[PDB]
């Protein structure tokens, strides 16, 4: 298959594609279930007045990552 077909099929495996909900709502955690690669700094202030920032980071959301991991192991279970 050409590259666009592969890229399109990739979206099924990445986190933020399957619906779910926690029965007790998670405190201080959003309920939206389509986030992908959240920024690592998490909205950290990067102006000139605050503490200087000299790092970069990328990461998924924890619950979405667990959901994707569990869905990747459906046939096994």
């Amino acid at each position: 298959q050409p590259l666009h077909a592969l890229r399109n099929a990739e979206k099924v495996l990445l986190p933020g594609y399957h619906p779910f909900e926690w029965q007790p709502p998670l405190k201080n955690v959003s309920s939206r279930t389509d986030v992908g690669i959240i920024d690592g700094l998490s909205g950290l202030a990067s102006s000139v007045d605050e503490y200087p920032v000299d790092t970069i980071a990328k990461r998924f959301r924890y619950d979405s990552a667990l959901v994707s991991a569990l869905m990747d192991m459906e046939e096994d279970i």
């Binding site: 201080n28 959240i38 998490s42 909205g43 202030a45 000139v48 007045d49 503490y51 200087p52 959301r61």
Partner: protein
């Protein structure tokens, strides 16, 4: 007016942006290091002294009744009069804003060996939320003292704080808080002359008036040139606080206040715009009720500052002003200067 190079000893890495130098009887003491205190100094309070343009950080211990206060990166230091200082707010090494309030002092001194007495104070009432980058002053009205806290930034409320924006900050309410150091009580005053959350400002204290200078507002991303007056009164009933806006302000944030002579201060350092840095100085003269902000001759800045993007310092106290700039990393991560005004 005169700039000078100063070399630092082996523990240069313990200096980070946001430290707080404190002066006790012509002796400047370091505070607010990087990371948690190690076995080299379990307390984290150093002896900031300079001999022949050379810096050597010496450790210090506490008394048998102190409280091992954690390092803070943006507290609100304030003198008080025996002689003692007050610390409130700031960012712990775990990125946690402290709500407590601290009181440093000297317990025993001999042969240049100072033993501190850190006492924690319990604040009750209209207590301020944990903040950082604010300011606090002490006013004297009818033989009484009172703390004047204002400004500062903090995280989102516990309900509106999400992990996707866990590090987002916002300016606090423009309320004015009076703190009684004896009873340990606070009181919230809202004033109609304050509508914008202010942070990283400059505060000048007098007998009964405090003067707010410059700062930054996250709600607008603007550097307003303001000049406020807050004349706190201490009658036999309830303290009445008033405000007044004054013309002729300065547009700067994160400046450094000092005191050359009595009833006159000097402003240096700061930031005019985001990418622009304030290179000129400013003289502040005071009287009984009048104020005057003038201009002086700019110091002879070197090629290092004129092209640097960030700098951080603090008032040494005896007319001099400590200053530091970043550098290469591998190497020396920071260069450090001193600036005298007398």
């Amino acid at each position: 007016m005169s700039l000078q190079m100063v070399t630092v000893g082996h523990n240069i890495a313990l200096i980070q942006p946001g430290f707080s130098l404190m002066n006790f009887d012509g002796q400047v003491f370091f505070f607010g290091q990087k990371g948690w205190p190690k076995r080299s100094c379990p307390t984290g309070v150093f002896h900031f002294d300079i001999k022949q343009n050379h810096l050597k950080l010496k450790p210090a211990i506490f008394s048998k009744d102190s409280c091992y206060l954690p390092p803070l990166r943006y507290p609100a230091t304030c003198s008080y009069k025996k002689h003692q200082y007050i610390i409130h707010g700031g960012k712990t090494p775990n990125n946690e804003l402290s709500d407590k309030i601290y009181i440093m002092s000297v317990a025993c001194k001999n042969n240049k060996k100072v033993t501190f007495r850190c006492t924690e104070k319990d604040l009750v009432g209209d207590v301020p939320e944990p903040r950082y980058g604010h300011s606090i002053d002490v006013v004297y009205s009818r033989g009484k003292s009172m703390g004047v806290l204002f400004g500062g930034r903090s995280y989102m409320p516990s309900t509106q704080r999400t992990t996707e924006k866990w590090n987002s900050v916002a300016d606090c309410l423009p309320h004015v808080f009076l703190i009684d150091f004896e009873f340990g009580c606070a009181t919230s005053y809202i004033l109609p002359e304050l509508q914008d959350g202010l942070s990283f400002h400059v505060s000048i204290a007098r007998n009964d008036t405090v003067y707010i200078l410059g700062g930054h507002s996250l709600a607008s991303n603007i550097r307003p040139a303001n000049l406020y007056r807050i004349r706190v009164d201490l009658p036999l009933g309830t303290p009445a606080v008033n405000c007044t806006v004054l013309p002729g302000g300065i547009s700067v944030s994160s400046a450094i206040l000092t005191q050359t002579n009595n009833d006159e201060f000097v402003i240096v350092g700061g930031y005019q715009l985001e990418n622009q840095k304030r290179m000129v100085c400013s003289l502040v003269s005071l009287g009984d009720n009048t104020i005057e902000i003038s201009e002086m001759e700019t110091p002879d800045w070197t090629s290092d500052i004129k092209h640097s993007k960030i700098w951080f310092g603090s008032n040494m106290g005896n007319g001099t002003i400590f200053l530091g700039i970043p550098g290469d990393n591998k190497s020396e991560a920071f260069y450090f200067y001193t600036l005298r005004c007398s």
